[PDB]
Subunit: 118 residues, 2 copies
């Protein structure tokens, strides 16, 4: 299956890409909200891992605009861990929301769970 | 025209109701997000003044769920005045966002402007 990893930090993108590859997923990457929508349209990923941050609001907007056309599963990843943050991510269309720093094994388990149910 | 005023503080609702009545609008009021959706469905207001606060997220949700079915103009009113707050209110479907405390004359002017363009 194909995963699009949207992350504006190259070090974190690289860790998730490495771990997802090791599980047998094909990985496409995007580093801002524009590349995220472009890759979403062109690559039709089976799931999207979306960090909230490039700048504060762009992840939420990416998820919002994807949801206009597609039910593709979205797992939001973010250092922001407040109730507001989690609640708003989910209400705007994320299927899950995981905080950083995260466990690589838990992330894999959550991606699997999302793909099973979709 | 008919305005639905959604405000969880009775003193502020009463001021807006008084001022809107004085301009010749018919006013319906709601005091939480449940009553807001109920009144929206039953009364079909021409415009909605929505305060963000009952609890923090419910105004945003009200606007979000109204926008599933209707293009009715929404003016959000809130003591929260940060960039994030204004930006997220508008992205979730508000047509305008006005901070409290507000000028009664400016509010009237903004309601008129919204109704003209709708």
């Amino acid at each position: 299956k194909k995963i699009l990893i949207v992350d504006d930090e190259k070090p974190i993108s690289d860790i998730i890409k490495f771990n997802m590859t090791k599980e047998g997923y094909e990985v496409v990457t995007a580093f801002n909200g524009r590349e995220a929508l472009e890759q979403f349209e062109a690559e039709q990923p089976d799931i999207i891992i979306l960090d909230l941050m490039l700048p504060e609001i762009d992840g939420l907007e990416v998820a919002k605009t994807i949801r206009k056309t597609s039910s593709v599963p979205i797992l939001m990843l973010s250092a922001k861990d407040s109730e507001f943050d989690k609640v708003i991510g989910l209400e705007l269309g994320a299927d899950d929301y995981v905080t950083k720093p995260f466990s690589n094994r838990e992330l894999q388990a959550r991606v699997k769970a999302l793909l099973r149910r979709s």
